[PDB]
Symmetry: D3
Subunit: 253 residues, 6 copies
Amino acid sequence: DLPVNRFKQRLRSGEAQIGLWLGLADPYCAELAANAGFDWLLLDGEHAPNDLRSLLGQLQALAPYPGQPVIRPVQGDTALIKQLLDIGAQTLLVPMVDSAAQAEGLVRAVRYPPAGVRGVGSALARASRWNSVAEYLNHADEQMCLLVQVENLEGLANLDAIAAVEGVDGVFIGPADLSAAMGHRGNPGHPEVQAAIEDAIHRIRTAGKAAGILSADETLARRYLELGCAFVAVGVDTSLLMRSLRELAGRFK
Amino acid sequence: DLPVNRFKQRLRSGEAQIGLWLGLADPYCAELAANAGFDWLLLDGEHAPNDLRSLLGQLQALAPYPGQPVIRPVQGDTALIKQLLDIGAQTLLVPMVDSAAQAEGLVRAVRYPPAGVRGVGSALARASRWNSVAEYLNHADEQMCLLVQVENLEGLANLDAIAAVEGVDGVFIGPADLSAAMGHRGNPGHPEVQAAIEDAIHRIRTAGKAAGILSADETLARRYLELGCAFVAVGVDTSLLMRSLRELAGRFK
Amino acid sequence: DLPVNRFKQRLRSGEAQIGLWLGLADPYCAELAANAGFDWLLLDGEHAPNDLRSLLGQLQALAPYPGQPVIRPVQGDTALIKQLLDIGAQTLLVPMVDSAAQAEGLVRAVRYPPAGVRGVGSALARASRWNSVAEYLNHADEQMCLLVQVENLEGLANLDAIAAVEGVDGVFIGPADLSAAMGHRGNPGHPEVQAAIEDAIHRIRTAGKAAGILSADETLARRYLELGCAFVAVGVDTSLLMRSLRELAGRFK
Amino acid sequence: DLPVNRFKQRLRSGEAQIGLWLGLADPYCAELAANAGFDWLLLDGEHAPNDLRSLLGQLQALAPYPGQPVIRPVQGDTALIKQLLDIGAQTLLVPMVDSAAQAEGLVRAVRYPPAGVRGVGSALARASRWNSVAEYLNHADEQMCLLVQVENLEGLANLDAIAAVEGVDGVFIGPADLSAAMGHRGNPGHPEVQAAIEDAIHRIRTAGKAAGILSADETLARRYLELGCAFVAVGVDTSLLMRSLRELAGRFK
Amino acid sequence: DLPVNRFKQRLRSGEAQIGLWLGLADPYCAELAANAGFDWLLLDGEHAPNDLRSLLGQLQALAPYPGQPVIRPVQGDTALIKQLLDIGAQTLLVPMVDSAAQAEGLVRAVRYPPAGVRGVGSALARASRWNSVAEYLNHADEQMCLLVQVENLEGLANLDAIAAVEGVDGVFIGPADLSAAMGHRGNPGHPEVQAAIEDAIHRIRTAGKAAGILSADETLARRYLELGCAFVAVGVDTSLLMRSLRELAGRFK
Amino acid sequence: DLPVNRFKQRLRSGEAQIGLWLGLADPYCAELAANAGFDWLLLDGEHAPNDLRSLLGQLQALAPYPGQPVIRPVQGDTALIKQLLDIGAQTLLVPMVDSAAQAEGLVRAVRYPPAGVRGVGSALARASRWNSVAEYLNHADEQMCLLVQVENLEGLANLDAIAAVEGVDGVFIGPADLSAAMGHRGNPGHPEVQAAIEDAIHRIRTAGKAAGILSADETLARRYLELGCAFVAVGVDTSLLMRSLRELAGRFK
């Protein structure tokens, strides 16, 4: 009984999915996030102090709750992706995808041969529940969801080719990196950046793929939802906690 | 150069100290809290999944920041107090203190002979920074700050005599347990419990000691500060995050 | 939405519940067992190298699966029980219960005041999902399941009184401890030990309580099931693994 | 007194070595396996949730026993192999070895200069026992044992070149990856795959190198030993534990 | 094949055993000490930040080397002693032993019934190698070695009775606590303390038991060995590390 | 208030900085070293069993003390460097830097766009204290300090070019690898290596950059300081501990 990837399902549905960014890098701190009611949670392996085993611990904490886990590897390395797939991850958000050719390789990385180059060691890992899931090899590709991050000028230039790649379910726009690449580091609200984001969202959707984004700014997140983004992250756990703590302290000092 | 206990100092001054409760039990999750500007942080060893090594991890993380660490052991056991002193804790919040005789024993547990029964083993622990602190054995008692929790109806009856035990610097009022003990479980706003809490605060102050309380309710905390409490916790890190997370999701679902 | 204790429910039903003993003391090794199909899993804090934090990880790994977790503390200590309850455990197997008065104290240990002495800290703990559960304090007592171990001569003498204690849902017989107590250390199959166990099961059942036992021996486990035991543990994860591995090696050497 | 690699020695002797695959990724779960009686134990860093620190813990747990540890890195990366060498691993099973040139790079990666490119930092590492081993730098190469995995079509085509490389002590055949590569994913029993495997074993032996394989099927493993395989793994710890537990449950449900 | 307690063996031979105190509380830091050449290593569970899981890791790290491990629990608690025995510790140094009645209880705690009160759960524990050791229950007592610390005035007065207790293999003198108890806190060199220590050593030996002590001062440690101490600890790893590091800095500052 | 890199400051002053190498890979073992009085501490991610999370723990332990932390990654990989920058490291010692082109790339790895290629994810990271540091993005580059290791013949040939690179504050000479590269493995004292080192220190200094080196030999370290090295490491923590222990043991055996 192969686990169904509900996040991949809803990407093709009409309704958008609201997400939370998890950077606390702890299974206990993560179980709290699983209780908040988000449709999906992003375990960040690129900018938070996460390793394979702590990602494994967070996957265990999240499993009972409705929110769907998405893992962002530090880079789109084949060996790292292979390890993330074996611990049970079915949706990956790969950063720094600059070209269609790079994206085509990422699709092969998540597929068993003939379709791909994913190594076969499923029996030993959580992904097949240690060979409990019958016919895992024949159907695992069906439940993988690949999301690519476009965050620099070259990726923006190749956006139409990257979104076109077969197997790329979604294209994620990282306003933080894109803004800095465009010369407005730390100012994603700038109209030049906003226009690029709005144009990027349109190009992704006409290719038939889901557009995704992260905004701690809620009104800005509402704008991205209005423009048709399929998956949107509306907060960061470390930032929400850090702001809440300092404001609570500020009220009494 | 024996570390000076600033929390113990500020207690004797006229300024109250604003605090935060730490139940995330992770040195990393704990360092955000240390960055929020509080006067003291409560490492909770009674109701959070902490242990001797996680409490040590959190003490290492907080040390560079202004906030003062206070540790609440699961119970006023002597072996446990010993191990917390060795890792460097200088302020303790001992729970379930019901009688002056009991508080007398706890004073002896934080003091070296002849004034107490604390074991001589400091030289190999962090408290002496591995025997770097000169004359630690002759001065350590002066930097220990013992805080007792009155949380039931025996301790409330015996509060005047508990506060008068020499070496009890502060008496802390746990409204949750106190409410339950009074038959208002989950109902600390009940005026029977508020009447007990205020009377308790006045009696501690008249004994010349420091009155402490925790209240996640900011109007109620403000009142406890207006009544003269020397140390008031104004939040719990788990609750602020759990709250912030579930309100954010609701603004989109 | 308070978690319902399904183990407690089925104890009152006609069907016996099949269990496995977990001594591997790791969240990853424990998730394999959660996949095995047992009705309940015993997380052993007495004879396995478990602490509060490792028990917490195993509870998180087990949660998605059907099997119900039972935690066995190293002893029936009040403060330890409070910690196990706060991390989310609802069924406890307390070892070395020798007298009705001790069993009566254990019932208070799992109940909130006024009725009991369980410390109140639900907002900070996993048991309430950090206060996500509405009115957790007013209904937590209903879902606690307390099981006591009778494993020596005195407990056997007071067996009728121990099972009579209100709040003692089940009485577990420990053949290894009982065998040694009776002068047949390492020989629980001895008829004097076996005669006591059959007598013990009958006395527990006429008191209206559930009788439990652990037998790695499968024919012996069937006999205990035949005698009406409500919960029987049929294996130990360490014994099964150690035995499979050396038998596999012996076949090739 | 430099540690002698008995796995490497026995390979040069007539005797075959019986092995077990370790995917539980814990020092405690690993020490049980060290008690089972195997000639060698495969600490899997490719498909099991292992990092550098967990492999080190497993090496320390393993050391008292006769079984020899073999580590499989996630990939044959020079920096990772250097880290594995410094924690004390002397035998490596490197996956995805496709060409003789790549096999040469791995041989040099385990050799100190001039012979190789292994970085010098032994005084700081367990490999030299923190410089307790006299003239470790002059004799370490002698006890390194390099094993390469041939697991795809390109590696099979270059098998004669790979086995010919000096310093490649053994060639390991991965039936799972090779079977998928040949158009028989999940069907290694197919005669095409079995013929390819037996031909590969013969060529490895005619090249003078040890041929190795993994077979959970016990009859198939005996055939591989009968064909002259020097190192054969006859089980996987996660598979054996998972199988025993669910079958034990089935006997009672 | 039951593990033999070699520390107890050398204790019964004529030669003294040289020991080192381990307070770094990490398996990696402990393996360095095992490589140093000491007869015994003291894993300090009383004044160092050690728990059950970290003591287990240190036991695993030390096992290959000649030095024998001795564990000192934080207190002579029965539940704690049982857990320490199950993880495989065979020699315990119990602090704060004041009377023969207490020492007799400690002997029973390390003995299986009928003789003692040690709980039976060895099949699940490392002590029996998870039931690999045949008839462990019938011979485990033979390999237990119990050492008691005499460190206060009441213990000194009852020294003859304590040493007389059957099952008390050795009596350990704690100079720091005894000196503080005698009114010379921080002044163990005072002749009154030294006269009491040398008299105590004589009384222990005249009872036929091994006399033990810790002396970082090397000339004083030689005196204790010449006076007949069977086991003497000549250093503390944290003190040796801290002293070497600060002196090296001073040579360049 | 962005943390100022005081290590980078003192490099531009006349005064040399005395350092210690940390390979114990534990936050607790690291805090002892933090107490020793060194100007800088090297957390070695190349030759000690350190990962990102253990390096973060040591930074938390190190922060309260004066010594400035320097991290050496296992290799100069861009994605790895991004992870070290986000956990708060401001000084990096990058191994195996052979050419100006490679050094220029490392300068980009540590600078935010436009100047560099460092990924922007600071809100989630300790480097900005989870966005407590105001306008961290505009000043982060200002406090980064890049130190390059020249440790082989190719690096030595391009040394003047490598030191000339803008943004390379210092060039570190690794005698152990350079010794082996020159055919004198294990013999850094050989005059050919020493002639190469002394020539290198001069060429590095004429470029205006800081010259750095590690020598456990104290008289050799004095010569390196006399020759004008700005940062010199005078010891290794594992070596000092291993030496103290075995020498203490030898005195009694």
